[PDB]
């Protein structure tokens, strides 16, 4: 197979500033007729693929005129001359010259914006879950950027370990924040062992950590 | 202009059709692509135009077990899986070169293929707004989706009314062996009296659907 | 000598 090696595999770039992506093949694209068989591609989050560039250097229709596509036979750049908040995305290279058909491994593009501190909200757990043995507490910290955060788990004061787990979404395409939620699930029984729950968050936009708390049937 | 239908078991089959309409499809060379979830996309096959042979090329990790094939009559294109393996889940999409290039756009909605073998439909426990959830006028509020297999679940808010500012979480994987997300909404405060929020939970690999309504606290 | 589509290019 042709392997399409693309580089880098991250890339922070500042709004309003340049951004250069590196698609490399083993084998020259480079077809009897002059064309370069490369496409590039983007994938917003949540999206299909949208055709930026075809065979080379031409740009697909719709694409705004800040991306451009160069280079011959085994060596490609996409160049995004001004990045926006909308080109937030991973982007793919893809070879057609020969069967199978392969991709880069993707280029993350993230957007870096203004640092935002997240607004952080809790959920007790449900009556409804209660009842049935279990207790789920939910930290969310919205709408944040950079996506780095601190989100520990304090019971009564005492720090937790072992009993929680994080995801976060991807970037936004239009304001450029993360959310981050941050699940504590304890058994019903242990979860009456105690009366303060809270999450305490750490983040750039955060001159002191924020504390999110509760009181077990409050 | 394409439009994917048809598309679930170990060892079973399933037919995607893929009709086409913008352009010529008889002239058309035709790739079929997928992309699992978490990963990059994957070229699945090919197919020429039957006036430059009709022939097909396939992957390798499908070779022998998927069958691509044209009809011109209906301008659809065809991928007929065979013996399906969990690993073949994926979005799959049908694809052209020449007519793609010359229209621009996407690859389309794609169709979601899930292979499914073990079952739990999910729990559906409200994310109640309160005073804890409530900052400079807006209130959070959404629904836990926990305890499922396999992925995924699909979170819509009031029969998909509501979209604006939710977020529903990428799925954890629990000690168990079983998925959990969240799905959360901003509102304003102002409204949790006299709005209705449901969340409306759809886990298709189970046949399952649940709506929760969201009461405030 | 691969085996693309030598009329993949629209102009």
Known sequence: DIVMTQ?????????????????????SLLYSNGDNYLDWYLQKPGQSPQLLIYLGSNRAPGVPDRFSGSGSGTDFTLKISRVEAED????????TLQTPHTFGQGTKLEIKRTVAAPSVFIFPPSDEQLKSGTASVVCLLNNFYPREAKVQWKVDNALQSGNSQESVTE??????????????????????????????????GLSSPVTKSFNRGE | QLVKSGGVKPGGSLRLSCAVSGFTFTDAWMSWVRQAPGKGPEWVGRIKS??????????????????????????????????????????????????????????????LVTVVSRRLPPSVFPLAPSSKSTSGGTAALGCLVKDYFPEPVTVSWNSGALTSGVHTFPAVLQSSGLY??????????????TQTYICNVNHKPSNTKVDKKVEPK | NPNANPNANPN
């Open chain 1, 7 to 27: 580089s880098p595999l991250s890339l922070p770039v500042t709004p309003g500033e340049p951004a250069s992506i590196s698609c490399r093949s083993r084998q």
């Open chain 1, 88 to 95: 937030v995305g991973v982007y793919y290279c893809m070879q």
């Open chain 2, 180 to 193: 959990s997300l969240s799905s959360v909404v901003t509102v304003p405060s102002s409204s949790l009296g």
């Open chain 1, 171 to 204: 970037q936004d395409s239009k304001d450029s924040t993360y959310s981050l939620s941050s699940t504590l699930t304890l058994s019903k029984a242990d979860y009456e062992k105690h009366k303060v729950y809270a999450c305490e968050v750490t983040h750039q």
């Open chain 2, 50 to 111: 039957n006036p430059d042979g009709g022939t097909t090329d396939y992957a390798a990790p499908v070779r022998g077990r998927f069958t691509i094939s044209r009809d011109d009559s209906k301008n659809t294109l065809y991928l007929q899986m065979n013996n399906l393996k969990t690993e073949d889940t994926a979005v799959y999409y049908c694809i052209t070169d020449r007519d793609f290039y010359r229209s621009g756009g996407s690859w389309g909605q794609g169709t």
